Amino acid sequence: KGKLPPGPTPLPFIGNYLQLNTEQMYNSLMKISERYGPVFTIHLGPRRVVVLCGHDAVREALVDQAEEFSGRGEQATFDWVFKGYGVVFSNGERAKQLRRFSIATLRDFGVGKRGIEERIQEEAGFLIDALRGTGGANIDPTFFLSRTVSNVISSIVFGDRFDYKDKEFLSLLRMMLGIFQFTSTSTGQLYEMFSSVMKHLPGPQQQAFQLLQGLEDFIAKKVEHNQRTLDPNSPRDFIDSFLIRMQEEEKNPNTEFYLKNLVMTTLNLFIGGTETVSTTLRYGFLLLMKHPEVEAKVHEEIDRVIGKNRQPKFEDRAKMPYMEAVIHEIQRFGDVIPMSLARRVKKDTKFRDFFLPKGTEVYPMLGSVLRDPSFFSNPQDFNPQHFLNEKGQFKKSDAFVPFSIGKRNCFGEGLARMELFLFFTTVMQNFRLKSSQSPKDIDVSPKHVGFATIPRNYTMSFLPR
Ligand code: HEM
Ligand SMILES: c1cc(SSc2ccncc2)ccn1
Numbered sequence: 001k002g003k004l005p006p007g008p009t010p011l012p013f014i015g016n017y018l019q020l021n022t023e024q025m026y027n028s029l030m031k032i033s034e035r036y037g038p039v040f041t042i043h044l045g046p047r048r049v050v051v052l053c054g055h056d057a058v059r060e061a062l063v064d065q066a067e068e069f070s071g072r073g074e075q076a077t078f079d080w081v082f083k084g085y086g087v088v089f090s091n092g093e094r095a096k097q098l099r100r101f102s103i104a105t106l107r108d109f110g111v112g113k114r115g116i117e118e119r120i121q122e123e124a125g126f127l128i129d130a131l132r133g134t135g136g137a138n139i140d141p142t143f144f145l146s147r148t149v150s151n152v153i154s155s156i157v158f159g160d161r162f163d164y165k166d167k168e169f170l171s172l173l174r175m176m177l178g179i180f181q182f183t184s185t186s187t188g189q190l191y192e193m194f195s196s197v198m199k200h201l202p203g204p205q206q207q208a209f210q211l212l213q214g215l216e217d218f219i220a221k222k223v224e225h226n227q228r229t230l231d232p233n234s235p236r237d238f239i240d241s242f243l244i245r246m247q248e249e250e251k252n253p254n255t256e257f258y259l260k261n262l263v264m265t266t267l268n269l270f271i272g273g274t275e276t277v278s279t280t281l282r283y284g285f286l287l288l289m290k291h292p293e294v295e296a297k298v299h300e301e302i303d304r305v306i307g308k309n310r311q312p313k314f315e316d317r318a319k320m321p322y323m324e325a326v327i328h329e330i331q332r333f334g335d336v337i338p339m340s341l342a343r344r345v346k347k348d349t350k351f352r353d354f355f356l357p358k359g360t361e362v363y364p365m366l367g368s369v370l371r372d373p374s375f376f377s378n379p380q381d382f383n384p385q386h387f388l389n390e391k392g393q394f395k396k397s398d399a400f401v402p403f404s405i406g407k408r409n410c411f412g413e414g415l416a417r418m419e420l421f422l423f424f425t426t427v428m429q430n431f432r433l434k435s436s437q438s439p440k441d442i443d444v445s446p447k448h449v450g451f452a453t454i455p456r457n458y459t460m461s462f463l464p465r
Contacts (some may be wrong), residue, residue: 015043073342084266153273
């Protein structure tokens with residue numbers, strides 16, 4: 001219609017700030033959607049953004065017009081350090097170049113293959129030892145899980161795992177959890193609107209920047225070490241591979257393979273390969289203790305298909321529809337990245353009689369699809385049946401989009417699914433979950449919701465079975 005999607009009239013500079021609640025962006029947007037429709041325009045400060053709500057609107061854009069919506073938008077906090085470099089926040093040629101290399105290199109190191117499956121199984125065994133080590137005490141699982149998860153991707157990018165005792169490793173994981181939570185707080189979402197000003201003011205954002213610089217510094221050190229010990233004929237990990245390609249691209253003035261893209265791309269994979277799976281696992285166990293009946297059914301299936309002796313393997317999932325449904329329901333309820341990572345229209349285009357000019361930022365509301373009442377009967381309830389038919393067999397859903405969809409969807413989905421199944425299964429096979437409080441007093445509502453969905457802090461006991 002030559003006109004952008006409908007939305008509330010914005011004010012100079014602050015945009016629609018007054019009609020939004022930074023502490024509850026999702027609820028604020030859904031409220032506006034009820035008045036303007038499933039597809040609308042919003043102004044986060046001066047950033048004009050088109051919001052897509054519900055399965056239909058999201059799929060039509062990201063898949064039906066995949067190319068048109070294949071551009072990458074921004075996440076102001078992360079942009080502070082990335083500045084458009086690296087695979088995640090890059091665009092155009094840089095994006096096509098870095099993504100293609102990352103996926104291939106990832107495959108070269110076992111992802112999607114027996115190689116990484118064995119890596120995950122071994123790390124899962126280390127988690128089991130670590131959990132038995134607690135002696136059934138009631139502890140905070142947070143870093144036990146993130147250390148295990150992080151060691152998988154760390155093996156690939158750094159060529160080796162971290163010792164669970166390594167204090168520098170714990171420091172890194174704390175940096176990641178800190179940034180992740182900051183982007184999900186009110187100040188974090190306020191930052192998304194007013195970064196032009198806030199990046200220069202005192203406040204929590206400065207601490208978040210500190211944590212990003214800490215992470216970047218660690219990667220820079222790793223790169224330098226690999227540089228002065230590199231064997232161009234035999235790469236030890238993702239970093240070496242990128243370094244070799246960089247050597248080959250030296251006589252190319254326009255190459256995308258240079259130090260800054262190496263540092264940022266590796267940072268993307270280190271953070272990306274750690275925080276979301278870790279958060280999903282953490283939310284998952286809380287959900288299971290909240291619903292004892294589900295844990296019991298999971299135990300019945302594991303003992304039947306796998307038993308108590310052997311280590312779970314990825315091929316076991318095809319014989320475990322219940323576990324498969326439980327994990328899917330954990331990702332659906334968890335809604336870890338509720339508004340996905342912002343996209344951007346790559347070229348002027350028409351969408352549902354709306355005119356979207358090149359460069360227009362887009363917010364695919366994944367959370368609104370994971371809870372779309374047209375695909376799930378009681379979207380607000382944690383219920384594995386959402387992914388099972390009456391015969392107890394696994395039932396797929398077009399609205400299951402926790403990894404998003406389209407041209408810039410998560411290429412870490414393969415690794416993540418294998419980690420979620422092996423870690424969830426191996427932990428449940430060996431332990432019974434014991435909550436600190438009664439199932440009735442357990443609060444599963446999120447602590448923060450912004451860029452991500454963060455579960456409340458909690459402690460628990462892992463009692464051997
Ligand atoms: C349960 C875990 C995970 C969730 C929920 C998740 C979610 C997402 C989402 C929603 C996106 C944005 C997609 C889009 O723009 O349309 C994405 C991007 C991405 N994810 Fe993940 N992810 C997970 C795990 C992984 C893992 C394990 C890695 C690391 C190997 C990873 C790396 C990436 C990368 C590199 C991108 C950017 C892709 C691009 O811009 O082309 N993710 N992820
Ligand atoms: C820095 C921050 C992020 S945001 S957390 C995340 C997003 C998508 N997939 C996994 C983790 C991703 C890559 N690099």
